[PDB]
Each structure stands twice: as C-alpha cells, then as structure tokens.
Amino acid sequence: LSKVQLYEDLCRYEDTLSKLVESVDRFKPNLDIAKDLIRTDEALFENVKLLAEYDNIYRNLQKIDKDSEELDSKTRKI
Amino acid sequence: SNTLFDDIFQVSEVDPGRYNKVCRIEAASTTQDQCKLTLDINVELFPVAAQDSLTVTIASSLNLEDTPATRSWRPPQAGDRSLADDYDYVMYGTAYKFEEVSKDLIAVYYSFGGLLMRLEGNYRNLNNLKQENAYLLIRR
Amino acid sequence: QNNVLNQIHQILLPTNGEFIPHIFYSLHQIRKDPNNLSNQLETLTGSIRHRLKLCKSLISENEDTKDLLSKSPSEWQDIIHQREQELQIKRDVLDDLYRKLQ
Amino acid sequence: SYVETLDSMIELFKDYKPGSITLENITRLCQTLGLESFTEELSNELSRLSTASKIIVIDVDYNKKQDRIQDVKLVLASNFDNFDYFNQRDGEHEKSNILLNSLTKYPDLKAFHNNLKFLYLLDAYSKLDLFKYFTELSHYIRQCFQDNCCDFKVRTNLNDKFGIYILTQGINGKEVPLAKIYLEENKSDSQYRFYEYIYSQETKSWINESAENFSNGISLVMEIV
C-alpha cells in the first residue's frame, strides 16, 4: 500500500474530512484544516483523471501483451 | 488540563438523607434554564446551604500546562501550582453513564468515590465530557 | 473501460454529492434545529463513510490494478515504450527467415 | 461563533472549486447562497436551468449527452436592458456574452462563480440600478482619463472576468493589464449608502447626485493585476 500513490491520497483526504466532521460535531470548526482539505482535493481529482488515463494504458498494454504472447506461441509452434 | 465544563449553579435544594457528612444538592444554572445538577458533597468539609451560587467546573487534569489515575497520587509539595488553588472543594471521579434524556438533553453521571453527580444539559456544552476520569472543582 | 476501474470511478465520482455537497446540505439542515441528537451530521455522513470503506475494499480486492497504481503515468509510458523494441527485435529475428529462405 | 464559521467554510469551498460543468453542479452552486433555481427536462438528453429572484432572469440549456451546454439567455426586468455582459476588448469585435464564454472555455465553475456573485450583488441592490451605473461608468471613466493626458485606456470584461480594466500601450502595440477598478462589498461594516457618480464638465470632479437611489455597503476600489 506504500508503493501506490492514490492510496495515501484518499487516506489523508478521508482523515481531513473525518477531522473536519469531528470539529463541527464538537462545535469548534477550523479553517486551516479546510485549506488543507482543499490542498488534498486537486490531487484526488487529477489522480482520477490519470486513472482514466490508466484505463487506456491498461487496454493498450493488454493489446501488446496479447500480441507478444501470440508471437511467442507462433515461435514455439514453428 | 483545560476546563471541560464551567458554569454557575444556584443550589435549589439540600437533602441530608440518612447521612451526617454527605448532602445531596439539587442545583440549576443561573444562565441556562436547562443545565441542572445533582451532586453529593461532603458538607463537613464544604458546607452548602440553599440558594447558594456555586461556580462548578469539570476538568480533565489539575495542572496548568496542557495535557501531553494511572499515576500514583502524591501529597502536594510546598509551591505546587494546580487548578485546585482557585477553587474551594475539589473531587476526583469516574464517568460511568452517558444517558440521553431527550433529543437535546444529555445527562452525564460521575462517581467521586461513591459521591454521585448527575449533570444534565444540552449537548453542545456537555460535548467535552467523555467516558474518562475528571476533576470537579467547586467555588463559592 | 476495465470493469473494476469503472466501478471505482462511478462510486467515487457519481454521475450527485461527491464528498462536500451532502455535508454542506446537512449543515444547512442543522439550521432548523441545532438541538436534536438525531440531527447529527455524522448520522447523515455514515453512508458516505461506508462508501469510503466500499472504495477501500474495491481497491484492495483487485491485484493488477494495484500493480498499475504503483508507478507514475510517465513511468508507465516510458516503460512500455522501452519494452516495445524487445518485441520489435523478436519480430525482426522472426522474419529474417523470409530473406534467409530466398 | 458557529453559524459564521460554517458560512465561512462553505464560502471557502465555493471559492476553491465548485465542481465541473454539470446541471446538478449549477443547481447546488446556486442553492448554496439561498437563492432558488429550477430546472426542466425536454427529453432524456436536453434540459434547461432558470434562475430569477426579482429582476435578473438567467437561463442555460444543458445537454446530458455531451456534458456541455449549447446556448444561454440572460435578461433583466429593470428599465435598462443594455447591460455590458459581453466582452469589449481590442483585436476583435466579437459579441458573445461572458457567461457563455466562462462555461464554454473553462471546464470548472470558478469564472462562473465570480461572474454569478457579481451578478447577484448587482441584482440584490439594483433602489439604485447598478447595472446601467456600471454600464456608463466605463464611458465616464474613459472620458475622465482622456483629459488626464496619461496613457490610460479603458476596457470592460477582460480575462473572462468583470470589472473595468485599465491598460496602456506597450512596445508591442498591444494593450497590457495593469490595474483594476470595480465594486466590492465590505464585511467589516454595512452602513454606507453608496451614491451615483456624476462627472462634471466644468470643474472635472465627481459630485453627489443621489437623493432616493442608494446601494448598501459597497465601494469602488482598486487592485493590481
């Protein structure tokens, strides 16, 4: 979990929202942690955009993985 | 360390019960019309009559500095500063029930070595009390 | 359009209240009665927090997407570009038999 | 105490990034500040959104298929319908309204955030009509700056945003932004009755003219570009 960059991103996004809801439930809200949650939001949203890019690189990587394995099959059968 | 709860109560009633040293007081807040208090007090050490204005404070610790009992209690040395210095009657006790009286009112039950306290009030100034050990400080 | 990527994408970014609209709608709803214990915003955001646990489960249960998420997109593009020419040399040592047979 | 800080944090969430361009984003962005908006569905793919409180009526036509709008309609119920909600810049004379520009160029709601708040603060106090006042304020300040014999050229609605832009001609021959003059609200105190500027032809100054028309808690200030 320490090698993937999205995981800690939603971890501290969840931590910021949980501490913010704890602060508003204890009736002492904070704006510095709201600014910190603002800092964590853009990383999440363009990480979602690069995950949409991950879908395309996964499908084209799968395409050349399958043509790699069929060319290997062709070599071993010949 | 810091004050979990601070209010001023007007002692409506004092019941000796069947005891000689302990009286149970009924008090209500001078500011709020909803925060009331049932409290066992050693009146031999701290005499309380009816219609008395008591400043009542609940704190998590007695030291002036912020929090960083499981530690052995020690007699106070000469020159020790504590939150008890500004009050007259300090008990230490355990919270043992968090009752929900209504949709707005919560009651918190404390036991100061068998001296029971019930603090009933709306939750947005009783939210600092949690299931822990607390000091009750009373001044007149 | 991989399946688990689609489920995590449309559970994290619905096509509605993502994280903030539900919570400020709730804290606007507190204005009617700030003294009701069933009117805690934690009660209303418990469903969203369960959605966070569902997102964690959907991320953790799948393994090749877990391997995909480990490196930067520029790193994946560079590694696929630098692994393509190995297949290129496989193809050219494959079809040099065409010029060897003639 | 509590209401003030919840309004400040929802204001800060508004200021940072109020979502991407969706119809439900528009509804919640308009519903944050307590002003009602209503939407209608032509079919499974086409919708309209309309907002009106007392004077301003704004409408946007949204398409679900392309996640993009197609056209807008902005009207005012006041006595002056020639408000400068278009873009006036040198280089070309295209007449397209800045709200359509803000939704079509930027895929976020920051430009429409600023423009919508300026529209709402003009509408809520427009009994001094701030629309026509800001409309001929550009012409008045241009005729004032022409008499100052200084390189102060006046435009309106530059960088997809409101205010009166003041510019100068550089080496390249193209006007460059320097400063900003605009209307801003002050949260420290709200007791100032804003009056209507009239530029004198004789003594070349600004003299009070308002007697019944007024605006509450607004001021006309600078900030650097």
Q: Which residues neighbour D14 within 8 Å (Cβ) at sequence distance 6 or greater?
A: D29, D32, D113
Give the amino acid at D195: Y
Dihedral sign computed on CA atoms, order D129, D135, D137, D140: negative
A contact chains, 3+ CB pairs < 8 A: B, C, D
By three-state DSSP, how is residue A64 classified? helix
Q: How were these coordinates obtained?
A: cryo-EM
Look at A71 and C87 and tell me if their CB atoms are within 8 Å.
yes
Site of tokens 């991103």 = A9
CA–chain centroid gap for B50, Å, is: 17
Site of tokens 């200084």 = D150
Q: Which residues neighbour D50 within 8 Å (Cβ) at sequence distance 6 or greater?
A: D37, D38, D39, D40, D57, D58, D59
In the numeric block, which tokens belong to residue D44?
A: 């499974």
Q: Which among D24, D29, D65, D66 is the top mutation candidate for probing chain C, defined by the most C β-carbons within 10 Å of its own β-carbon?
A: D24
Domain containing residue B91: 1-140
Q: A64 vs chain B: nearest CA distance in angstroms? A: 58
**Pairing verdict, β B115-122 and B133-139:** unpaired
d(CA B126, CA B134): 13
Q: Which residues neighbour D190 within 8 Å (Cβ) at sequence distance 6 or greater?
A: D216, D217
CA distances from A19 to B101, C16, D29 (A): 27, 23, 24
In the numeric block, which tokens belong to residue D18?
A: 């109020």
The contact set of D with C (CB < 8 A) is 2-3, 6, 10, 13, 19, 24, 28, 32
Helix (H) or strand (E) holding B53: strand B53-59
CA–chain centroid gap for B99, Å, is: 17
Residues of A in contact with D6 (CB under 8 A): 24, 29
Structural domain count, chain B:
1
Residues of D in contact with C16 (CB under 8 A): 24
A52 touches chain D (CB under 8 A): no
Nearest to C22 by CA among C41, C5, C2, C6: C41
Resolution reading in Å: 3.0
Residue D130, Cβ neighbours under 10 Å: how many? 23
Nearest to C24 among D13, D19, D24 (CB): D13
Look at A29 and D17 and tell me if their CB atoms are within 8 Å.
no
Angle between helices A5-25 and C20-29 (to 10 degrees): 0
Give the amino acid at B70: T
A3 touches chain C (CB under 8 A): yes
The widest CA-to-CA distance across chain B, in whole angstroms, is 48
Least CA distance to D6: which residue of chain C?
Answer: C27
Look at B100 and C37 and tell me if their CB atoms are within 8 Å.
yes
d(CA B105, CA B120): 7
Q: Is D154 within 8 Å of D141 (Cβ atoms)?
A: yes
Helix (H) or strand (E) holding D102: helix D98-105
Look at C73 and A25 and tell me if their CB atoms are within 8 Å.
no
Q: D3 vs chain A: nearest CA distance in angstroms? A: 10
In the numeric block, which tokens belong to residue B118?
A: 């019930």
- Number of helices and strands in chain B (H, E): 1, 8
Q: Which among C50, C59, C69 is the top mutation candidate for probing chain A, defined by the most A β-carbons within 10 Å of its own β-carbon?
A: C69
The widest CA-to-CA distance across chain C, in whole angstroms, is 92
The contact set of D with A (CB < 8 A) is 2, 5-6, 8-9, 12-13, 16-17
Nearest to D24 by CA among D65, D64, D52: D64
Query: What CATH number should be reported for the domain holding residue B68?
Result: 2.40.50.140
d(CA B137, CA B58): 6
Helix (H) or strand (E) holding B136: strand B133-139
C38 touches chain D (CB under 8 A): no
Q: B102 vs chain C: nearest CA distance in angstroms? A: 8
